[PDB]
Design a protein around this ligand. Structure first.
Ligand SMILES: Clc1cccc(-c2cc(NCc3ccncc3)n3nccc3n2)c1Cl
Length: 290
């Protein structure tokens, strides 16, 4: 750590404080994250080779005095702040499309190596002045787990959590990240969180209120999941035209596939990249204020 000069505290992450820092050597500007069981060390070590343009680069791992620090490529802003800043007029559709397209490329790459994110949310989708967007903290969930509260006691959001996780599935798949991304896609379009749950049951019931209470027809096996209760109220499914106006038919079709209840039926990142919604995709340069 003596090799870094902390510039400023940028946030309180799930696992510890996050700082903008400078390498006292290469003068490099990086993000430094404070987080050790050998298993965690090995899992994180593997992430050093999981490199792709849409995945924030893991530069190094420092394990000293029995403390763990992760050094990442630095990006100036996150999607949460960009969305709040674009609340008045909303993010232009071409830019939402470009961001979704890029995030799907990031997921397709990691998923092809069987690595999941598991806790995708706007706060960990980072953007630069070139029109790129990247996934931060990929793979950390398997290495360290996803706690109920962060190190500073802040509630870890449930808003983007897949229903199979909420229903107690033990071995969820790469489909969980597609669900989260679909929730983020809808939020960029409407300028409001899709399912802003404030407890596990509120999260589930908000999902059911929009997509209908899942049953054996739409999700074979659902009634046998650990946290499924036959006493759940039965809500009817809303039309997507009501859920995400003014998204076009291509967008609504893709969203609806990203939010399928059955994880085995939910669209993959690779399939989503081939969807007609991306026919006219471009790479606009957003207006950033650093
Ligand atoms: Cl708290 C938290 C949670 C998840 C990811 C992050 C977080 C945020 C950024 N940059 C965005 C940013 C820059 C300056 N001030 C605020 C944000 N980065 N940049 C590389 C890793 C990283 N992780 C952070 Cl800070």
């Amino acid at each position: 750590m003596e090799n870094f000069q902390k510039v400023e505290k940028i946030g309180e992450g799930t696992y510890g404080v996050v700082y903008k820092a400078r390498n006292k050597l290469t003068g490099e500007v990086v993000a430094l994250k404070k987080i050790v069981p050998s298993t965690a060390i090995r899992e994180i070590s593997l992430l050093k080779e999981l490199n792709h343009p849409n995945i924030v680069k893991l530069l190094d791992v420092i394990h000293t005095e029995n403390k763990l620090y992760l050094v990442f490529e630095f990006l100036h802003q996150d999607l949460k702040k960009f969305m709040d800043a674009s609340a008045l007029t909303g993010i232009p559709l071409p830019l939402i499309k470009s961001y979704l397209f890029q995030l799907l490329q990031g997921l397709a790459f990691c998923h092809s190596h069987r690595v999941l994110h598991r806790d995708l949310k706007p706060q960990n989708l980072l953007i630069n002045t070139e029109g790129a967007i990247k996934l931060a903290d990929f793979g950390l969930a398997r290495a360290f787990g996803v706690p109920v509260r962060t190190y500073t006691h802040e509630v870890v959001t449930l808003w983007y959590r897949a229903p199979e996780i909420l229903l107690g599935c033990k071995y969820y798949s790469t489909a969980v990240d597609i669900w989260s991304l679909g929730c983020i896609f809808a939020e960029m379009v409407t300028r409001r969180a899709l399912f802003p749950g404030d407890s596990e049951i509120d999260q589930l019931f908000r999902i059911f209120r929009t997509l209908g209470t899942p049953d054996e027809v739409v999700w074979p096996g659902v009634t046998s999941m650990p946290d499924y209760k036959p006493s759940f109220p039965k809500w009817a499914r809303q039309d997507f035209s009501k859920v995400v106006p003014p998204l076009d038919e291509d967008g609504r079709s893709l969203l609806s596939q990203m939010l399928h209840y059955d994880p085995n039926k939910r669209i993959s990142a690779k399939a989503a990249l081939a969807h007609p919604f991306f026919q006219d995709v471009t790479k606009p340069v957003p207006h950033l204020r650093l």
